[PDB]
């Protein structure tokens, strides 16, 4: 079928839906290089024996948004070697005895990294991926209309109706210029002489700052009109720094697009709100906004938390992921930090503290019941010495350079982890590791990412490794991709792997990134889905399949998933999707669940794991 934008009007009385279609059996035996599949098994296990997961899952669960007293003690943190330890409430000598040490995770990483580029396995996986594609195509050739029509039995639900989530957005870029601009243009007119910032000697009003930069008012525009502390002074304003680097920042940008500024945030916040309202307008578009924490100051956490509250920043549709930019090397010139450790300390303690004693870090709590995952960033392509095994602890790391990627995630994993396996303990919300990974850079980012995280933000590079791509299939790791953005720098649009990763059944989702820089419409991400559908030729069952599993990839409450997709959603497979609220043919997912079940069987060579429920 492919491409709904066009699709003409038709008919119908289907008032009783239909599974059933062409089944395609194949099966294939096996060669001596089963000792490959074996290798996959390991990597497949490893990941499992690692990525943390809540011992008791959401669906097995037993006015405003803030306050309420708690108090309950329970103690000790005791962070040893970048990996916190939290010993038994009193004082133990074993602790909540979890997590695998740094080295190990590095040696397992090499392990994956071997198999990953080992000759014959690269071959088998390629053969199996492309083989995966074909089948889906063949299937399309036999059943696209069977799928088209099923959708007609759920008269109500069509594209709009289905709730789709912007699984990868950076809060800040989340606004359309026409709006943003007009926000500014206005708050100038209707309030010039209002102190805003204090740079170069005195506090300036608004009118000041502007005439100060000169080029201002009716001339203002999103483009480079964030022209600075202002001068000749040197700062590169590529793009990552323009959002990832806290300092050397411009003037309007410090005023309007940040929170740790002077007027506390009265303007960024203020903007967010009208974002949310219009968000809550179209009812179906959700958002997993990325918010930062550099880990230079212990405050940042509470500091940010309070930003949320004091501004009443909450929506049903929005949740948050904390993004820590991997910029230590900058924070080590600026002398504000002395050894990597300091950072683990600025993010993995201000929380932990808040977990043991809620009230020691109140309205940080009311925030964390809204935080859903920890995303780490920066230009993936900056060069790096890929970590060995005998690797310097986090507090032996004083040297001038930024620690590698792998290194980042690791300590960013354990902590996250050992902290998670307690907020769980105490019955509080938990955060998931959802790294930006594989957008550029080295292949190992993914390898490591594969061993330790939930979702992922990019995956563009899975395209250069049959093997990792194949695992991610099996494992069903889920990718939140922004084609339209990826198209900016790193990759031509038409050369982007999404559609292909989609055909082969990888857990892909379409995201947005920077709607400010990127889109032309009032409705950002729909517009994504829409140009996507058109260049790649996608049907609705296709978009709907995408939007649907955007949600599975999401971090919202069971209460809302159930209501959005189905009360049976926790079920592995077809019997787990209510087309009346999903609009995707029981037959598309049955095809998908059975081709996957098949592959799994191929690799656990008859002796498969199975599981009858999805996962978190």
From the annotation, which residues make up the binding site for Zn(2+)?
168, 170, 436, 513
Indicate which single residue of 240, 301, 320, 352 sits in contact with ligand CF5 (rule: CB under 6 A). Answer: 240
Taking alpha carbons only, the member of 610, 599, 539 closest to residue 133 is 599
Residues 85, 228, 458, 586: which is the catalytic one?
A: 458
- Which is nearer to a copy of itself, 77 or 159 (by Cβ)? 159
- Write down the residue that tokens 């740079």 correspond to: 199
The mark string for 146-175 relative to ligand CF5 (x by CB under 6 A, - otherwise) is: ------------------------x--x--
CA pseudo-torsion sign 481, 484, 488, 491:
positive
Options 42-50, 417-425, 463-471, 509-517: segment touching ligand CF5 (CB under 6 A)? 509-517
> Can you read off the two tokens belonging to residue 375?
């995303």
Please report how close the Cβ of residue 206 comes to a copy of itself at its closest, in angstroms: 19
For residue 145, the surrounding DSSP H or E stretch is: helix 119-150
Q: Does 277 bind a copy of itself (CB under 8 A)?
A: no
Radius of gyration of the chain (CA): 25
Q: Does 518 bind a copy of itself (CB under 8 A)?
A: yes
- Which is nearer to ligand CF5, 37 or 490 (by Cβ)? 490
CB nearest ligand CF5: which residue?
A: 243
- Which is nearer to a copy of itself, 24 or 222 (by Cβ)? 222
Binding partner at 302 among ligand CF5, a copy of itself, Zn ion, none, C-beta below 5 to 8 Å by kind: none
Query: Torsions phi, psi of 542, nearest 5?
Result: -70, -50
Q: Does 436 bind ligand CF5 (CB under 6 A)?
A: yes
Please report how close the Cβ of residue 534 comes to a copy of itself at its closest, in angstroms: 5
Q: Does 218 bind a copy of itself (CB under 8 A)?
A: yes
> Can you read off the two tokens belonging to residue 25?
């059996």
Residue 120 near residue 36, CB atoms below 8 Å: yes
∠ CA(549), CA(553), CA(556), 5° rounding? 110
> Can you read off the two tokens belonging to residue 464?
């250069």
Rounded to the nearest angstrom, the gap between the alpha carbon of residue 1 and the centroid of all alpha carbons in its chain is: 31
Residue 594 near residue 27, CB atoms below 8 Å: no
Q: After which residues is the chain broken (C to N over 2.5 A)?
A: 62
- Write down the residue that tokens 């411009």 correspond to: 250
- Rounded CA gap, 202 and 411, in Å? 42
Q: Enumerate the known binding-site residues.
A: 66-73, 168, 170, 239-244, 436, 439, 513-517
- Three-state secondary-structure class, residue 412: helix
- Three-state secondary-structure class, residue 211: helix
- Concerning whether 458 is annotated as a catalytic residue, the answer is yes
- Which is nearer to ligand CF5, 289 or 556 (by Cβ)? 289
Please report how close the Cβ of residue 170 comes to Zn ion at its closest, in angstroms: 5
> Can you read off the two tokens belonging to residue 324?
């820590």
Residues at the site binding Zn ion, with contacts judged by CB under 5 A: 513
Residue numbers at the binding site for a copy of itself (CB under 8 A): 3-13, 15, 152, 155-156, 158-160, 177-178, 215, 218-225, 237-239, 242, 282, 484-485, 487-489, 493, 517-523, 526-527, 529-531, 533-535
Q: Which residues bind ligand CF5 (CB under 6 A)?
A: 9, 170, 173, 239-240, 242-244, 377, 436, 439, 457, 485, 513-514, 516-517
Catalytic residues: 458
């Amino acid at each position: 079928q492919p491409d709904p934008i066009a699709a003409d009007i038709l008919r119908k009385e289907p008032e009783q839906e239909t599974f059933v279609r062409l089944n395609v059996p194949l099966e294939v035996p096996t060669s001596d290089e089963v000792e490959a599949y074996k290798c996959l098994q390991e990597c497949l296990e490893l990941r499992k024996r690692y990525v943390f997961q809540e011992t008791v899952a959401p669906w097995e669960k037993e006015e405003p948004f803030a306050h309420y007293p708690q108090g309950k003690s329970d103690h000790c943190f005791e962070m040893q070697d970048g990996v916190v330890h939290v010993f038994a409430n009193k004082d133990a000598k074993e602790d909540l005895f979890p997590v695998a040490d740094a080295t190990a995770f590095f040696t397992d990483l090499h392990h994956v990294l071997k198999v990953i580029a080992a000759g014959n396995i690269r071959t088998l996986c390629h053969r199996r991926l492309v083989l995966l594609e074909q089948k889906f195509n063949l299937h399309l050739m036999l059943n696209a209309d069977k799928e088209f029509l099923a959708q007609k039995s759920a008269p109500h639900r069509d594209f709009y109706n289905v709730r789709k989530v912007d699984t990868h957005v950076h809060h800040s870029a989340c606004m359309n210029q026409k709006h943003l601009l007009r926000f500014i243009k206005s708050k100038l007119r209707k309030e010039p002489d209002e102190v805003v910032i204090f740079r170069d000697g005195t506090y300036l009003t608004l009118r000041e700052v502007f005439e100060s930069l000169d080029l201002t008012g009716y001339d203002l525009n999103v483009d480079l009109l964030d022209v600075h502390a202002d001068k000749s002074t040197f700062h590169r304003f590529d793009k990552f720094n323009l959002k990832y680097n806290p300092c050397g920042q411009s003037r309007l940008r410090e005023i309007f697009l940040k929170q740790d500024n002077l007027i506390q945030g009265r303007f960024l916040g203020e903007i967010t709100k009208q974002v949310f309202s219009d968000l809550e307008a179209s009812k179906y578009q959700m958002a997993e906004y990325r918010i930062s924490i550099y880990g230079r100051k212990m405050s940042e956490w509470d500091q940010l938390a309070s930003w949320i509250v004091n501004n009443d920043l909450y929506s049903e549709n929005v949740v948050w992921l904390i993004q820590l930019p991997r910029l230590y090397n900058i924070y080590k010139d600026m002398g504000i930090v002395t050894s990597f450790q300091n950072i683990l300390d600025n993010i993995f303690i201000p929380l932990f503290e808040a977990t043991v004693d809620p009230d020691s870090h109140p309205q940080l709590h009311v925030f964390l019941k809204q935080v859903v995952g920890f995303d780490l960033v920066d230009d993936e392509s900056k060069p790096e010495r890929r970590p060995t095994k005998h690797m310097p602890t986090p507090a032996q790391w004083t040297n001038a350079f930024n620690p590698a990627f792998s290194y980042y995630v690791y300590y960013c994993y354990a902590n996250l982890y050992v902290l998670n396996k307690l907020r769980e303990s105490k019955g509080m919300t938990t955060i998931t590791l959802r790294p930006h990974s594989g957008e550029a850079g080295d292949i190992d980012h993914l390898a490591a990412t594969f061993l330790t995280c939930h979702s992922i933000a990019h995956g563009i590079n899975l395209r250069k490794s049959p093997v990792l791509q194949y695992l991610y299939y099996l494992a069903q790791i889920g990718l939140a991709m922004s084609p339209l953005s990826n198209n900016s720098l790193f990759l031509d649009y038409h050369r982007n792997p999404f559609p292909v990763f989609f055909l082969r059944g990888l857990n892909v989702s379409l995201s947005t990134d920077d709607p400010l820089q990127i889109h032309l419409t009032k409705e950002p991400l729909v517009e994504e889905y829409s140009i996507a559908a058109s260049v790649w030729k996608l049907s609705a069952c296709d978009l709907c399949e995408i939007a649907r599993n955007s949600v599975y990839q999401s971090g919202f409450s069971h209460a809302l998933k159930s209501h959005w997709i189905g009360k049976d959603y926790y079920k592995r497979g077809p019997d787990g999707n209510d087309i009346h609220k999903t609009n995707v043919p029981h037959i598309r997912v049955e095809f998908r669940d059975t081709i996957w079940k098949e592959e799994m069987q191929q690799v656990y060579l008859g002796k498969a794991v199975i599981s009858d429920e999805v996962v978190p």
